Design a protein around this ligand. Sequence first.
Ligand SMILES: OC[C@H]1O[C@@](CO)(O[C@H]2O[C@H](CO)[C@@H](O)[C@H](O)[C@H]2O)[C@@H](O)[C@@H]1O
Ligand SMILES: OC[C@H]1O[C@@](CO)(O[C@H]2O[C@H](CO)[C@@H](O)[C@H](O)[C@H]2O)[C@@H](O)[C@@H]1O
Ligand SMILES: OC[C@H]1O[C@@](CO)(O[C@H]2O[C@H](CO)[C@@H](O)[C@H](O)[C@H]2O)[C@@H](O)[C@@H]1O
Ligand SMILES: [Cu+2]
Ligand SMILES: [Cu+2]
Ligand SMILES: [Cu+2]
Ligand SMILES: [Cu+2]
Ligand SMILES: [Cu+2]
Ligand SMILES: [Cu+2]
Lengths: 345, 345, 345
Amino acid sequence: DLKLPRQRVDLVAPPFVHVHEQATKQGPKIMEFKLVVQEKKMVIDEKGTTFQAMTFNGSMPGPLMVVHEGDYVEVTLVNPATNTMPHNIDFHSATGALGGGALTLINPGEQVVLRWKATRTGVFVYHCAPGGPMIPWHVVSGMNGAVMVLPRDGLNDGHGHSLRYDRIYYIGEQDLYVPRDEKGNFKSYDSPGEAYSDTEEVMRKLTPTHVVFNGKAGALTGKNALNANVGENVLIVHSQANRDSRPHLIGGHGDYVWETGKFSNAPETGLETWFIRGGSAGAALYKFLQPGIYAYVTHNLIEAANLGATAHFKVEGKWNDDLMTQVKAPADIPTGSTNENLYFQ
Amino acid sequence: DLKLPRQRVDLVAPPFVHVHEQATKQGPKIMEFKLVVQEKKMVIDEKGTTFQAMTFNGSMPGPLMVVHEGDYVEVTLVNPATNTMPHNIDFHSATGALGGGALTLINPGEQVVLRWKATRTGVFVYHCAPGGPMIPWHVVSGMNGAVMVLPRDGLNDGHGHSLRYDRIYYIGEQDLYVPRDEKGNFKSYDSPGEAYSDTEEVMRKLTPTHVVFNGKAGALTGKNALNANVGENVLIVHSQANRDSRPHLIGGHGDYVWETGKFSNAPETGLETWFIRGGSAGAALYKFLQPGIYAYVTHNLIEAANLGATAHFKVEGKWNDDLMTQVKAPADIPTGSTNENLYFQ
Amino acid sequence: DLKLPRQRVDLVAPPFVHVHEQATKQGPKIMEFKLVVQEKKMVIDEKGTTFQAMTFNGSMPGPLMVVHEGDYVEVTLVNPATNTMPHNIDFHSATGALGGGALTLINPGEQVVLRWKATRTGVFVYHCAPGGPMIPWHVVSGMNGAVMVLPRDGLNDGHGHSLRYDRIYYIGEQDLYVPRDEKGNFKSYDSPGEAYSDTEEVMRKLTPTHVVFNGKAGALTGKNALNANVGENVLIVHSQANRDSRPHLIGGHGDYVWETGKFSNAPETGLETWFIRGGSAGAALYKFLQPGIYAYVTHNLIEAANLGATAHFKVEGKWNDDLMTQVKAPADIPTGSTNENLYFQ
Ligand SMILES: OC[C@H]1O[C@@](CO)(O[C@H]2O[C@H](CO)[C@@H](O)[C@H](O)[C@H]2O)[C@@H](O)[C@@H]1O
Ligand SMILES: OC[C@H]1O[C@@](CO)(O[C@H]2O[C@H](CO)[C@@H](O)[C@H](O)[C@H]2O)[C@@H](O)[C@@H]1O
Ligand SMILES: OC[C@H]1O[C@@](CO)(O[C@H]2O[C@H](CO)[C@@H](O)[C@H](O)[C@H]2O)[C@@H](O)[C@@H]1O
Ligand SMILES: [Cu+2]
Ligand SMILES: [Cu+2]
Ligand SMILES: [Cu+2]
Ligand SMILES: [Cu+2]
Ligand SMILES: [Cu+2]
Ligand SMILES: [Cu+2]
């Protein structure tokens, strides 16, 4: 009885995002997405540590789904018989039935079709939540992603002016809990079930061993740095399904930030660092003003540098010496300098 | 010389709240409350672990006090001689004398009467704070609650429209620090003083062993689930006197949320997850749109599922298939399906 | 080619702040500051524990720099040859080159001159960031401070009214990671390089051993309590370069708080406790209404009382019995009292 146009969306792997319109004059549609659960061993750091992961569509995070206010979202969730455990899905964007989790529990070899109406604008987490202690374990094993519900008029600045991005990236941050042996080395396991009891012990102490973007330390550095150009307005969606984060663009700012992630609320302007509460997604716009490398981090710098949570942007364009310049390059401290007379000596 | 009507309020045990008016045309009154300190052993999880607690009025959290802007609040704090330690009270809603703590220190066998004017609207923490290392120890042993100071016109949406709740609940979240023996089992003690040195060692590592609502894992699940009905606007006051929390209603949203908890500031709309800074109370309104079970959690899901921090709502009414529906129930993956051709394989 | 008046600013040690104008009709200037790196052993708690610190200008935090929107800030960073490591500086207030870090790396015996334009208003962190795992280590060793960029019209309340402070203090909060030996005692080292490997092990577990204001437990208590007077509007700038904090003035409120620290956004009013995200600075105004001692804490009370994070204000003036009064001093519980009949017994 729901008589609306259907449109199939093909998702893509983060940090990229499937094609979509920002503002639209299309009416509501049934937007059709498919997510396939994949349990698999994955590499999670630069020394090659492996991890028994559980994923939607084979990536951590799961892919970003993008729809508009008033759309209906029809998700086919597939759990292939190569998997070992039951899984489900819960959308923070949806209303009722534990976000859908109470309607989507599937054993290996099954699939299920859920439809939810996109009544709330913003970016939101989705994640597996099979029940009881399985809920944190499936989420911290990788089973989480995000959905963005745009207003039909696109974003605005909360003061009646339109905002448009030239580029969008989805940064999913994952806290991981990898057991260590007596000597302090990370342990390997042959299946998720085998990893569980030792992993739950690490989870109970609430301190991750790794905090990574796009599934692995170094995932978005080197060859896979994020590209941009001076002058582009870039939207950075950040999610964390289980633990707080404090995003910061080193060398930049958040020009417009919805740190609680919901477009019915005006964004804050000109932030240095913002805050993603565990269990949520947020979003920040920035217009690049300078070329060069930028690091995007969580600004617990121990997590950023030592546990895996740094991404890079490589920005092409012309340097602006008015905004910043090296007035004098490193040189020897002048013989005639008198720093021994300073107040703090 | 303060010549105002006096009115005695009888408090009730959380998560319920004493009767009160939201909007009022009554002028300022002296609102009279009594809190009695009770030290006692309490059960704090589903395996029966006991804990040497310290409470106001025998509950964790202490009861919610509700007054209106401009009222004076006259609290009699009683420390019976069955107790072993000095106690006091500090109201974050009050001005001066460390929130009252500097005027309320009482030994066992004593009582004291403090009056403070309710000049600041919002929900606020109160807690014991005897001095030095006793302050965290008394708070994490259970000695904290909240007070709500409503505007005399009731709540509003920050854009000139009145908000009214049909139902109010007070969720106090408590981080607990229970010592373990060599084998990892929780230790029992015969008095608070006996528990102190081992408890302080756990406190120093900043990682709770339990994170509970209404004093115990499972307190607000099963028979003691919170009731509501489709269509009701429910106010959920959440406090945490010592540690951050990130509340989330699974299956719902925060329609209007004052996460810093102060009604002079407009609420944010349509949140998935909000943030209670340690040392504060916040409040969220939600109008239920779907029947069924909802879980209310802190969205560190390890804390929610494994350390005790889940409550349930049981909501009666009719399901709305427009907002969400199971289009196809779990079924075998069709023989003819082609999932091996997906981008991520 | 930048033809503007130059003005040299002499910095002072926190928590005080160099002299400056709040509102100004002066046009943009080049504001000249000098920071000298000093590595040195410092005492960090009341039992005399020492720490191999690294500082700007010999203090933790580094000094507060205050400029106005549109100024250019020309910083000479000096690394004397008595130091052992390379250092640099990154300003969250600046645009480009990792906030300046990519233009300021200096070996011992060198200095460098960076100029950045103050295009963003607010309070912001600055810190050393030499590269890779050196970044967290230099920051948690003390190499961080803050800069305030005021609007040229001074502060306002976001609703078109001017705000002016009578007094400003800069509270820098530092999380420290001090190794312990087998017996649990803090270890001492003869140099930063010698401390590094054991310190990095403590850093990886993300739990500080000390959380201090102005560099040491007790720094701003006793003789060095902060002064104020009833009626004064006091601005309290709080920074944390690496870890979240939740500031609270015990006995007071935040009348106007910019917890994300950026003056383009209206402040929130009447807060009990606010939140400084790690990697940021925030600011709160309060007009003192009562004399006496106030404690300013992070409201994880374990950190405040047991790990060093308490400051005091000593406020002179006349008590206001209307706002708060002790109606009856501690007395014996009346023989005739009937507390055994209360609901919770
Ligand atoms: O009290 C009514 C009764 O109906 C149930 C039957 O399973 O289902 C309702 O809720 C479901 C979603 O949670 C809907 O899919 C279903 O169609 C609706 O009828 C029970 O949950 C409930 O006890
Ligand atoms: O400097 C004045 C002096 O007055 C004291 C005396 O104890 O008390 C004032 O503050 C109290 C609350 O903190 C009030 O109850 C009291 O009535 C008021 O006079 C001292 O604290 C202070 O040194
Ligand atoms: O692609 C251009 C090229 O220019 C470089 C040369 O080192 O420098 C630019 O960026 C610097 C700041 O990061 C400025 O100081 C410099 O003046 C500007 O020309 C490279 O980083 C870059 O590869
Ligand atoms: Cu799963
Ligand atoms: Cu969730
Ligand atoms: Cu007490
Ligand atoms: Cu307090
Ligand atoms: Cu350095
Ligand atoms: Cu930084």
